[PDB]
Design an enzyme around this catalytic site. Structure first.
Site, PDB file in Angstrom:
ATOM      1  N   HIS B  12       0.753  -1.274   0.000  1.00 44.19           N
ATOM      2  CA  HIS B  12       0.000   0.000   0.000  1.00 44.19           C
ATOM      3  C   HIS B  12       0.777   1.315   0.000  1.00 44.19           C
ATOM      4  CE1 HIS B  12      -3.456  -2.646   0.774  1.00 44.19           C
ATOM      5  NE2 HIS B  12      -2.776  -3.150   1.787  1.00 44.19           N
ATOM      6  N   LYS B  36      10.302  26.473 -16.157  1.00 43.45           N
ATOM      7  CA  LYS B  36       8.929  26.938 -16.142  1.00 43.45           C
ATOM      8  C   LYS B  36       8.399  27.018 -14.707  1.00 43.45           C
ATOM      9  CE  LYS B  36       4.438  26.761 -18.261  1.00 43.45           C
ATOM     10  NZ  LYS B  36       3.274  25.905 -18.476  1.00 43.45           N
ATOM     11  N   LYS B  61      -9.741  33.669 -17.456  1.00 44.49           N
ATOM     12  CA  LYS B  61      -9.073  34.421 -16.394  1.00 44.49           C
ATOM     13  C   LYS B  61      -8.835  35.894 -16.750  1.00 44.49           C
ATOM     14  CE  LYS B  61      -5.488  34.080 -12.972  1.00 44.49           C
ATOM     15  NZ  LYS B  61      -4.023  34.013 -12.749  1.00 44.49           N
ATOM     16  N   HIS B 114      -5.454  26.031 -24.458  1.00 46.36           N
ATOM     17  CA  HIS B 114      -4.793  26.588 -23.296  1.00 46.36           C
ATOM     18  C   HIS B 114      -5.417  25.967 -22.069  1.00 46.36           C
ATOM     19  CE1 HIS B 114      -2.550  29.532 -25.596  1.00 46.36           C
ATOM     20  NE2 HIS B 114      -3.674  29.851 -26.217  1.00 46.36           N
ATOM     21  N   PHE B 115      -4.583  25.723 -21.062  1.00 50.72           N
ATOM     22  CA  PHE B 115      -5.067  25.520 -19.708  1.00 50.72           C
ATOM     23  C   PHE B 115      -5.220  26.871 -19.034  1.00 50.72           C
ATOM     24  CE2 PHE B 115      -5.973  22.439 -16.527  1.00 50.72           C
ATOM     25  CZ  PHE B 115      -5.860  23.123 -15.341  1.00 50.72           C
ATOM     26  N   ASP B 116      -6.450  27.250 -18.761  1.00 54.32           N
ATOM     27  CA  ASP B 116      -6.728  28.538 -18.116  1.00 54.32           C
ATOM     28  C   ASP B 116      -6.552  28.515 -16.592  1.00 54.32           C
ATOM     29  OD1 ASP B 116      -7.577  31.232 -18.957  1.00 54.32           O
ATOM     30  OD2 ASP B 116      -9.277  30.913 -17.563  1.00 54.32           O
TER      31      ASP B 116
END
Ligand code: NA
Lengths: 120, 120
Positions: B12, B36, B61, B114-116
């Protein structure tokens, strides 16, 4: 040359985590002699999990032994054997979740020895 | 010969996730020329993420373009560069979460580009 869409794949997609249970159930010997039907893996430092033995005591699922619930919810992965699988061919659905874990502890030192369950 | 505690570790525990970001930020070229500072990865089938472009529209955004929020919350991983890191040695804290994702989409076929952001 790199499309916006491909760049989104490169930068933000990792669907490969789907392969995790098949890999780990095998590597950790839970597919020797039998396909283990369900299993949970905890993705936290060992120490953090060990400390749960000193967090909120609760009743074990089956009423037996001494179990404890994590104060914090933890990153885990549930592996479930597919209905189609037949030993020696063990395939698993991988399900990542955040949950409180419940472990049974014993011994000296007092440490985790069974994964009892998880909870929202 | 295998202790109950060691067996719990084998069945586990997987604390190795903490190096995921370090590995992936490198593999996916987000540590070429620069570290980044932040990045998010989505652990869901590509198709499921693409379908978000047809789910709840919301404001991006920065108010620019067309964004959409996932009906379900999805498994993701936020990578944050450590303050100490200096190119070419990029170290990242790995933070798994379940969140609704917000992506910007465009084109024909209409797809994520795009990842906003993400949301509880
Ligand atoms: Na996929």
């Amino acid at each position: 040359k790199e499309s916006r869409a491909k760049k989104f794949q490169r930068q933000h997609m990792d669907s490969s985590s789907s392969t995790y249970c098949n890999q780990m159930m095998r590597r950790r010997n839970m597919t020797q002699g039998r396909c283990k039907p369900v299993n949970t893996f905890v993705h936290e430092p060992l120490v953090d999990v060990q400390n749960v033995c000193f967090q909120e005591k609760v009743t074990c699922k089956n009423g037996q032994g001494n179990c404890y619930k994590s104060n914090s919810s933890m990153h885990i992965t549930d592996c479930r054997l597919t209905n189609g699988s037949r030993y020696p061919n063990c395939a698993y659905r991988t399900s990542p979740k955040e949950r409180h874990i419940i472990v049974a502890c014993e011994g000296s030192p007092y440490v985790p020895v069974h994964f009892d369950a998880s909870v929202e």
